[PDB]
Structure 1
Amino acid sequence: DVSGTVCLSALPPEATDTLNLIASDGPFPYSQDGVVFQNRESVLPTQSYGYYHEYTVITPGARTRGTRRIICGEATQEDYYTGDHYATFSLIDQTC
């Protein structure tokens, strides 16, 4: 299940940077950005393979990719944020 919707303005600023890179088709800072997210745990709605893609949301100061990600779906404005490495997701509202 999706935890609710959150205003893009309420997420860390780096989430806005990721969304802007997704709108321009990169380039992305990590080679793992844009790979398929399989939704293996069934947390997001069931869809065909390839419907979802995952992108890193940079954690300031981290040496690794950390735990924040944006997951996009194929629908218009369907983007989810996770701050705990795919345990919970919120739908991102880009209008606020």
Structure 2
Amino acid sequence: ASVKAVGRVCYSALPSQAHDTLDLIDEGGPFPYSQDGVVFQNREGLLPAHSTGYYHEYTVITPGSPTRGARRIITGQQWQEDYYTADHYASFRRVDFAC
């Protein structure tokens, strides 16, 4: 069933590549993978339900991966509403910018 909140991961605990990603989003790129910036549909309902176009996804590079890999940042529309998945969207944690 439904749950009241997504869990959290401290900004300081993210891998450094995720910090790089957040910076690339701020700077508008350049993005390493062609699917960077696409709309994320949130089809499994792991993140709060919103209309199509609320969320976008961006690669977080996995060191030594010859392919895109499993890590991503998903951005929401609200201030500081960034989510991290390290497992191809099987789970997310909301980035806590205060720690």
| TM-score of the superposed pair, with normalisation by structure 1 | 0.93
1:3, distance to aligned residue in structure 2 (A): 4.4
Whether contact under 8 Å (1:3, 1:88) holds in the other structure is: no
Is 1:46 matched with 2:49? yes
1:43-69 CA-partner distances (Å, limit 9, x unpaired): 111100000000000000111111000
Give every structure 1 segment of 4 or more consecutive aligned residues whose post-TM-superposition deviation is greater than 2 Å: none
| Counterpart for residue 87 of structure 1 | 90
Which of residues 38, 41, 45 in structure 2 aligns to 1:35? 38
Shift of 1:94: 2.4
* Unpaired stretches in structure 1, ≥5 consecutive residues: none
User: Would you say the 8 A contact 1:37–1:54 is kept in 2?
Assistant: yes
Deviates more, 1:31-40 or 1:2-11: 2-11
Q: Give the share of equivalent positions with the same residue, in percent.
A: 68
Gaps of 5+ in 2: none
2:40 and 2:57 in contact (8 A); partners too: yes
Q: What CA distance in whole angstroms lies between the structure 1 residues aligned with 2:24 and 2:97?
A: 14
Give the TM-score of the pair, scaled to structure 2.
0.91
> 1:31 Cα shift?
1.3
Q: How many residues align?
A: 96
CA RMSD of aligned residues (A): 1.2
